[PDB]
Amino acid sequence: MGGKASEAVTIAFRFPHRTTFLVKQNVGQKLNKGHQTFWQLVAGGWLFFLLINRTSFKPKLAAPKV
Amino acid sequence: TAVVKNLAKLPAATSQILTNVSKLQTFHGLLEERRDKYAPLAYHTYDNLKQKTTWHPIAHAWVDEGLPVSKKEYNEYCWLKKDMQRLLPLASPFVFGIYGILPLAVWLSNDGYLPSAFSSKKDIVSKKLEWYSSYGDDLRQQVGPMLQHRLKRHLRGTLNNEHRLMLDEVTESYKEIFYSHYTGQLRDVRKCAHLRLYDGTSTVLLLTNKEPVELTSELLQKWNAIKAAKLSPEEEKKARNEALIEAYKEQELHGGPHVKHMQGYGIPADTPLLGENAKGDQYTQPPESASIPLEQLEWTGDTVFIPAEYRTEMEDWGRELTKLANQFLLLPWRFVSNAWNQRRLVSWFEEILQEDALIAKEGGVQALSDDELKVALLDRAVIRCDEELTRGDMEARYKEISWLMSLRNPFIVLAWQTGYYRSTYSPEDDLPEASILPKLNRTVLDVDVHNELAPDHPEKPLPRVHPALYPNSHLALAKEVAVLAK
Amino acid sequence: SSPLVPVWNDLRALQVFTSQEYMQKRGPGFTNTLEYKLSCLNPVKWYDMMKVMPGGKAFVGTALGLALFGGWGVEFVKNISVMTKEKPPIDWNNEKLGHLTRS
Amino acid sequence: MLNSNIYIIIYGGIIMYSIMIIIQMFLYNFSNKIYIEVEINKYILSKNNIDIYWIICNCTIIIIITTLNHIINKIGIYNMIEYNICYWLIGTGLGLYISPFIVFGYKFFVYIMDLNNYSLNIYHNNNKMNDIQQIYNGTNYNDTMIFFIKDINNIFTIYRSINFFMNWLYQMIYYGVRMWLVFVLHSFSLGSFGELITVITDNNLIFNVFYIGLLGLGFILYLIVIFYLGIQIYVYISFSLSFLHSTILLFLVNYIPHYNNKSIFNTFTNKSIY
Amino acid sequence: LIPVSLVDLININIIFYILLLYTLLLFFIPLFLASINYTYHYIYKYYNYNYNFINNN
Amino acid sequence: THAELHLFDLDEFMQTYKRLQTRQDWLIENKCKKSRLFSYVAAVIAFTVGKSATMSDEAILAKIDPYVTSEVRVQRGAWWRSGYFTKEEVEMMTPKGPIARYYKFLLGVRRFPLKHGALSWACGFVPAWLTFTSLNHWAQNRRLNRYLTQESVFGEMARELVRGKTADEATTSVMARVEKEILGVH
Amino acid sequence: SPNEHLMFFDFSSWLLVDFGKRWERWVSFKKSFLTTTRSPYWSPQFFLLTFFQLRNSNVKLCENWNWAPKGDDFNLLHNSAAEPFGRDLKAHLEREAGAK
Amino acid sequence: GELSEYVEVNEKGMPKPQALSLWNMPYAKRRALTKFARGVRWQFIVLFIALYNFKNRDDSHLLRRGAYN
Amino acid sequence: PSTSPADKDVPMSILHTHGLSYVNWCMSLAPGLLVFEGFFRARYYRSRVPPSRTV
């Protein structure tokens, strides 16, 4: 019942590739980055999403009105 | 106790903490502004199992040769980064609650747990030395021997399998590097470089528009010559591509790059044509770049470093050896993958290399003070504060580990460092007796870095030849002579 | 294991290398077709090509497929031996029990 | 009351009988250490050898200890413990089952989660279309309209990843049940023959004598029992480890040839070019 | 037969046995590791660096 | 930080006396389930968007560039051979999802890169953790508020617990009403 | 007996555990710990001590199974009922006649 | 040998036959056979069993309610 | 609560024991211990020979 390791490929056949570190010359690609006010608006949207989905616990609804 | 002593200055410490944060921000702004236009893109790479990133200094540790900065300012930058790391327990009340103040009390108890602001000293060197001598050397002196054992047992392996894993040519060098606390003799760094024989040959493939070409000493020499000639780019690129096609032909005659016939790496052949797509005898489909003539061979500006570290690579180290390597270097290690500790170690490596560059700009080691050199060696983890060495021994130690770190291999670096933290204690009071000989003295001349050393054969070690005994040594050592006599 | 393993291997190789043969035969121009441009906007393709990515994305894809659809698959397997079985009528809740005035 | 959900647990003689099993480990001092060293170095070569070795050693010596306590130190639980199925499935089999997953769990987990991305394994995969199929479509195979049945596919693929880890479980259960049956049935058969002999002799007191001898029969039965049970324990251990090899440890065969280094005293770096 | 029982398959008493046993194992591991090998004695005694000196003359 | 403590006992009561559950209580629980499930996706989105604010261009190209998203299946030599993969072929291998497009847009966006490690990860985990915890907390608060205005057995139990009463006392007080009004005691 | 040797009668007692009371006291300890510490909702303490319990309760309260499990609502053994024709009807009528 | 989901390759990039050769037939026949095949065998069997049991599902519980009257 | 009933407290006497057979006593493995205690003691304490003089 069930298979064996002898009946299957190894953990070295899968995942056979060792590591090679790539490097690239700097032409100036990571310069002149725009959207300087992006994260401000992102944080604003996050806080807005949290506020609309906010619900304060109102135990006064359990007051003995009857 | 120290808790109330530090609470007394906790009000006076917040202002200094914020000032230090501002200094850190300014310095990081400058450094990143330089890095984003002068440094290359070191791409992220995943380990053999392809689940976590792996890191090596050759690609990720960049040195800004030309950083307009004083060495002390860089020391401040690094020390304040470490202080930011040490400021982390302040988040405990903001995640646990008002009862998350007992961790803050434990933080304030020991001064070694704290950042610079809680220190009475002013100069960064004196502050660093105080922290080291109080907490850090003691913390490091209890990880060194165990780290050394882990590195040994990483090479030789577990469960009596040394005959299958160890090499018979690195044997005497292994013994001299790891068992010289038995003999009491000094060590040669080249015998630690011999540990790289466990690894394969480290190569560098430059990627072109046609094929990748292996970098060699000749091609690199030609490129340095062209860079020094300061020619026009119409001539510079032409000469570079001439050297590139020459090296391409040379390696094609050699039998291709070394990487084609190395387990774990390889260059694919031309793709196959399947079934009816096969046009008679042409069973292959060459790539597009085959259409390009070889005379148009141009370097893409892209490079591939292949260390071929089959036994030394930090991936195969393990969950424990990585943590101990970060402990021994007084870096953060807890509750993180080995990839993050790899990055931390590589960042420490980069810091040390940049500091070495700035020291060489500032006039070498001899321009430094005694406390400054002591602190540098403490950062390099080659000195413990219970030694009281001479200046020449310190200079030789710096030169040794600086050359060893120039090779960009953490394993041999740690193997070298851990040898300076093997101290014993005697059970008797009379023994060890008071010595009769003077203190150990050396010089920068006694360190042999400018010469190659073949691995001594097993059970046939050879004596050490001083560099001065070599022919024409007075000409080779003339720089060190001029630096020392002055 | 069974002795039919090489048979299944031959058939697997057949389908794999025939699909590769088709991909070679049709040559370039696949990106200009509508199939590619629609698959670019297809979440099935995003998931399938994210599965094989590195960084634990295989575990992420497997666990996501489990959490989303594999639970329904477990239920489906459990229900194969339930469809044929005599079951009683569903005692639908009369929605009368539970109401109670507040005081 | 309604909220009170009551459970009855059974409890017997456990503490003092389990303490001495561990206290005896200082006397045995892992006499089985060399055998398991030899076998582990036969079956696998890795840095994590010692780990699995220690596990097996502990497991094995405990078994051995219990067996001797089952043969000699006959009190309370030591008699039943080898006649119980829970001890043979959970007290011996589960530890050996989870030992490789605790030592090599990282690699096995990565392998298993990669095999959910089922694909045909090609040797000398110098093909280009294979890569495009594996990345774009996810697999070598045709995955067109398999999402239509994804609900089953996922779980089925999960089994497809662990099917080659399942015979280890089967062999563990099988050999635990085998040891249980062996001990129980042989003890029962031997006692039954003894009781039949006693019935023959009690009704015929001319034979109700120490006819073989006081020590002869006892010495012979001692030798028979110890020889048989030692053979069975050796069978259990050796076959468990051979099946561990053939089922779980052949995944971890990664032979790296030694490649000579040349650039020892000089390394090319990012600063060499840039 | 008595041992042929589903009650004895997941017997909590044997689970307590296993629990106490392996907790005690864990407690006593640092005493099982306290055996001395004489390999570093050999290394100290037999490792002899080259003591010959250099003499150009 | 106070509704969950009552909701524990309320949930125990509901599990025991689930027969007394109306349709509106079921809908309340389903709404809490919906919020809990969406909280996972919100946490994932917040984690991505937060960690992306501290990732260098290399860390993003690790997720866009097919050189890095192919390390499991493809040889690295297939990428060093120029012309092995064509431009359209490299294009189809790139990820097309919304995260990949977000990152592609984010290449040209100014941010505050950090070295790849625990801080770049914490800068996503903290917003994600706060989002998840706060959304679930407010969901439980909404659940309790909905139960309190519900004219049912569970609403009465929740009300009695919000007064400041003990679990056992409230169970007895509510079961005294259940026996009389609901069950019709003898 | 041999079977007598295959028996474990070394029992000592019966441990009785009211898991309902123990669960109630565990929940009470969790509430007391979270109140005394004044811990917020975003804390790992509050999360570990609240979220899984609330999740499991919501799951067990949201469940609306059309049918109960296999061996509780169907797939059950039932003796065959008497038919309204043939021999069963004759036996029923004969019983009615004999009784009356 | 004869591993699962494994296949060797010759110098021509073609799969070597482990048991049976099916590369003599033209590409059109292979594409006809394999266009509808997948990397999945037992799921289709379980699905056909489920479809048989669904075609032959029981509806007594609906008869009791009167949906067929 | 905890209990300790009197049903477990019963009379005891070795006179009422059925006992064992010769076969069951041989199966008790006492005759094996009887021999092998001396065997192992002899092996251990006879492996270590002292010095002597040959006469």
Ligand SMILES: CCCCCCCCCCCCO[C@@H]1O[C@H](CO)[C@@H](O[C@H]2O[C@H](CO)[C@@H](O)[C@H](O)[C@H]2O)[C@H](O)[C@H]1O
């Ligand atoms: C190499 C030999 C090959 C031939 C194999 C022959 C089978 C031998 C089986 C040996 C195992 C029998 O195992 C042995 O069974 C006997 C008989 O119950 C048990 O004996 C015990 O129970 C019996 C049952 O009445 C009591 O009478 C006896 O006093 C007691 O010692 C032993 O405690 C157990 O160790």
